[PDB]
Design a protein around this ligand. Sequence first.
Ligand code: HEM
Ligand SMILES: C=C(C)[C@H]1CC=C(C)CC1
Length: 137
Amino acid sequence: GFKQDIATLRGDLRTYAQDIFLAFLNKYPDEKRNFKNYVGKSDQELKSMAKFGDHTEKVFNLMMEVADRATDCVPLASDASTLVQMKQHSGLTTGNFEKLFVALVEYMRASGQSFDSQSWDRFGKNLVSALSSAGMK
Ligand code: HEM
Ligand SMILES: C=C(C)[C@H]1CC=C(C)CC1
């Protein structure tokens, strides 16, 4: 289920984080705007941009903590505020997070693994809702 999935992802987090974030940027190429340095780069190229591996892993480190502290795929309001109140998310809307979670769920669906993809989809919905409530537009 969801908790085991957090363990699975954490066991190879660098690899999952890159592959899911790349799935996100390739499904929604306009989202590369948020990361100028990423434009005109193949996946392999991105995977050798220091900022890429480090921002991606830090995104997934914190996403797995927020997932771990959730009850029934509902994140802590305190975690939602943090994501809203981060200066680097100033430009962001819940739409940015929507699309990340659509790509993550689709990645899990297409994987050969028994990810609880329905739980991740509810998690993404609930986090978007929490982000709105915490003041993201
Ligand atoms: C659960 C979802 C997310 C988490 C946990 C998260 C977490 C983080 C963290 C921890 C940082 C700081 C990393 C660092 O610079 O050292 C960061 C930076 C940033 N995040 Fe997010 N993030 C999430 C979703 C998003 C989404 C959906 C976007 C855009 C569509 C985004 C855009 C950015 C940008 C642009 C930066 C700074 C730019 C850079 O990488 O140099 N984040 N995020
Ligand atoms: C495109 C990727 C991997 C970005 C994810 C999050 C941050 C903060 C920058 C790298």
